Amino acid sequence: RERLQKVAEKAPLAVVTGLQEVTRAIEKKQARMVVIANNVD
């Protein structure tokens, strides 16, 4: 919110989170490393 409020008058580099976004990052070969939880139910 602060960044957008400042820009009115992109985001810093970060991990990719979420199953949809992470899957897309893998499919497009944009991920350099992928960390997967072992206990998803």
């Binding site: 199953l19 949809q20 899957t23 897309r24």
Partner: protein
């Protein structure tokens, strides 16, 4: 997206890994209640295809139904009248088991609106269907143009009237044209317009 992987994996129910997962799940479901409330659906891809959304006011329940043919509930298995009606063990219920599970869910919790359901597992004795239900009083539901149709009282207990997908299935409404002419808009509607005597004024 990831949906494709989940959907393909759920097209492989007879593989060893899916059979292992389903065996563990079916044992656990065996030791639970006939009706169970779930925080999240077991098959998110299927649930979302059927209209489930990860929103306030959306609920998922797992309903268990017993397998087998219907036993005709006559005293001591004795029937009367013509031999044509004398069968006790070989008749089949004219509703499917998914519709039955939806009806049991809807009857039990009358404050909810049943939306849809899907298959999740089955035993030799049991079948488990997860029913999707909506709270019609939640503000999130009432202010959503995608789902607030179900707030209107014509959709109260729509599963009791065969109006969900499973009910439509056993009503024959998956077919159109010449494969469904005697059952549209319903069997009774077609019987009414095929069997009533018309008296034109000048005849």
């Amino acid at each position: 997206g990831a949906f494709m992987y989940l959907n393909e994996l759920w097209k492989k129910k007879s593989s060893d890994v899916m059979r292992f997962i389903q065996r563990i799940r079916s044992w656990e479901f065996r030791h639970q209640h006939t009706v169970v409330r779930l925080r999240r659906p077991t098959r998110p891809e299927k649930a979302r295809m059927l209209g489930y959304k990860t929103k306030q006011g959306f609920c998922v329940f797992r309903v268990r139904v017993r397998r087998g043919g219907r036993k005709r509930p006559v005293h001591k298995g004795i029937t009367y009248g013509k031999p044509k009606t004398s069968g006790v063990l070989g008749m089949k219920l004219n509703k499917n088991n998914q519709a039955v599970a939806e009806q049991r869910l809807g009857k039990r919790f009358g404050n909810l609106r049943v939306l849809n359901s899907y298959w999740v597992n089955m035993d030799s004795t049991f079948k488990w269907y997860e029913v999707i239900a909506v709270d019609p009083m939640c503000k999130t539901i009432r202010r959503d143009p995608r789902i607030n149709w179900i707030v209107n009282s014509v959709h109260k207990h729509r599963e009791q009237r065969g109006l969900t997908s499973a009910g439509r299935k056993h009503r024959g409404l998956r077919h159109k044209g010449h494969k469904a002419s005697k059952l549209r808009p319903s069997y009774r509607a077609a019987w009414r317009r095929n069997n009533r005597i018309v008296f034109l004024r000048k005849r």
